[PDB]
């Protein structure tokens, strides 16, 4: 099955009908203000009325702002795209930071285009050069059309094609019983391979045997393909066709991220505007997520101003676990939360607070029921005392070894002696930090 993820127990925000945040919903307890604020944010995402909006999430480590940001995508669904990106990915050797952020802005937004396809496929029963009778003194023989037979399990059908395609059928190898791909709209003819029925005549043959297609001879089906503006920017960035020698050699070369000029962006915006005016393509906005925003360079902080002031900028969310810190790139400059005041004024700050011991016990119970672990009352109280003493995260991490050791000992439930032995063997971060002080001279 699916491997259990730390955030996999968060299925969404769990909002009510009136907009208020239920206390316990979708495995989330507490943080009513943050869940309601994000509850308005998802209404902005669904509304699509504004662009370039930047939200900020601040608070102590372990408050669940990442669980809320990831819960936003779960509440929105799979219709709108969601692009989490850490600030560490902004620094790259080949591609510049501004091109990284731009390509992320193109990664958020996406398109969906509906298209119909008509395809003829099957085994070839017969191929005839149908000859009409029109003898002329200028040219002796006349051929009106070529008949191509096709056989499938559901039915057989014959097709009357112009003789011009027989020049390609004679240009490439075509044998009786060859399963071929023929599209009516494109008009091109490709050879799939030999049918599996004739594979029994020879013990060894070079041609591979593809099975006969199961279905009607003429297949017309409508499929909607979703392609993001970033994919469009890459396909427009490098040619996919390898007919050219420079495209073949460049295809042999190692692919590297290239800086894309704004002209291609403008052309994409224009053709996208045209298809939107036609109504065939459906455009949906994306949701960009950013974690460890305090790790960005000051050049990225100033670039986010011109990036956010644009109307094509998708909604961006930020996550900052740090307080007042020195801005990276400048030694003597200090700013609250680790972000300059210019961007910090533009972003919408959301405050988060630490959980109470009761909420710690409830979250521990939720994680226990998620991982499928049973906890006794008293051991849950002592574990809540441990989490309150140090952190919620450590008390969450203490669940697995007590479950495994409990199964080894034969007890299907966790006991205070189990969490006591586990708490004795393993060391919390603060206790280890205090132990390092005495032996620091030997280190």
């Amino acid at each position: 099955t699916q491997r259990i993820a730390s955030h996999s127990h968060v299925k969404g925000l769990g909002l009510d009908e009136s907009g208020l945040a239920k206390q316990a919903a979708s495995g989330l307890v507490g943080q009513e203000n943050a869940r309601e604020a994000c509850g308005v944010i998802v209404e902005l995402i669904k509304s699509k009325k504004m662009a370039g909006r930047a939200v900020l999430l601040a608070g102590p480590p372990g408050t669940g702002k990442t669980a809320l940001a990831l819960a936003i995508a779960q509440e929105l669904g799979s219709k709108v795209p969601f692009c989490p990106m850490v600030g560490s990915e902004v620094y790259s050797t080949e591609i510049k930071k501004t091109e990284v952020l731009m390509e992320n802005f193109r990664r958020a937004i996406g398109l969906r285009i509906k298209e119909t396809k008509e395809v003829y496929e099957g085994e070839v029963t017969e191929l005839t050069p149908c000859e009409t009778e029109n003898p002329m003194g200028g040219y002796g023989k006349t051929i009106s059309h070529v008949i191509i037979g096709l056989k499938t399990a559901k039915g057989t059908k014959q097709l009357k094609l112009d003789p011009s395609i027989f020049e390609s059928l004679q240009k490439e190898r075509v044998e009786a019983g060859d399963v071929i791909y023929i599209e009516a709209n494109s008009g091109a003819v490709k050879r799939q391979g030999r049918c599996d029925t004739y594979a029994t005549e020879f013990d060894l043959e070079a041609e591979e045997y593809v099975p006969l297609p199961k279905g009607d001879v003429h297949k017309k089906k409508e499929i909607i393909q979703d392609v993001t503006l970033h994919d469009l920017d890459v396909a427009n960035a490098r040619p996919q066709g390898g007919q050219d020698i420079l495209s073949m050699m460049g295809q042999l070369m190692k692919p590297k991220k290239t800086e894309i000029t704004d002209k291609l962006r403008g052309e994409i915006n224009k053709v996208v505007n045209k298809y939107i005016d036609q109504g065939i393509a459906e455009l949906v906005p994306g949701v960009l997520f950013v974690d460890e925003v305090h790790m960005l360079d000051i050049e990225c902080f100033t670039y986010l101003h011109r990036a956010l002031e644009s109307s094509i900028a998708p909604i961006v969310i930020f996550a900052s676990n740090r307080g007042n810190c020195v801005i990276r790139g400048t030694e003597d400059i200090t700013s609250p939360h680790g972000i300059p005041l210019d961007l910090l004024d533009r972003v919408m700050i959301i405050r988060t607070m630490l959980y109470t011991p009761q909420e710690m016990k409830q979250i521990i119970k939720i994680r226990a029921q998620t991982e499928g672990i049973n906890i006794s009352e008293e051991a849950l109280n002592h574990l809540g005392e441990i989490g309150t003493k140090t952190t919620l995260r450590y008390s969450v991490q203490l669940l697995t070894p007590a479950n495994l050791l409990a199964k080894i000992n034969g007890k299907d439930s966790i006991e205070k002696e189990h969490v006591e032995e586990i708490s004795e063997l393993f060391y919390d971060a603060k206790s280890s930090a205090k132990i390092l002080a005495d032996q620091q001279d030997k280190y």
Binding site: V124, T125, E126, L127, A176, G177, Y198, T200, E201, D203
Partner: protein
Amino acid sequence: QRPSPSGPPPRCSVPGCPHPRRYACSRTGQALCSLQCYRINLQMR
């Protein structure tokens, strides 16, 4: 036009076996699937 396909498939030499023939044997002049039946065919020939 495609010719009429052969109805009967080829079969193995030892006829408690028979399966589509994997290879042909020149010494015994008969087709066999595996060395197991090949021992019986070579012993019979």
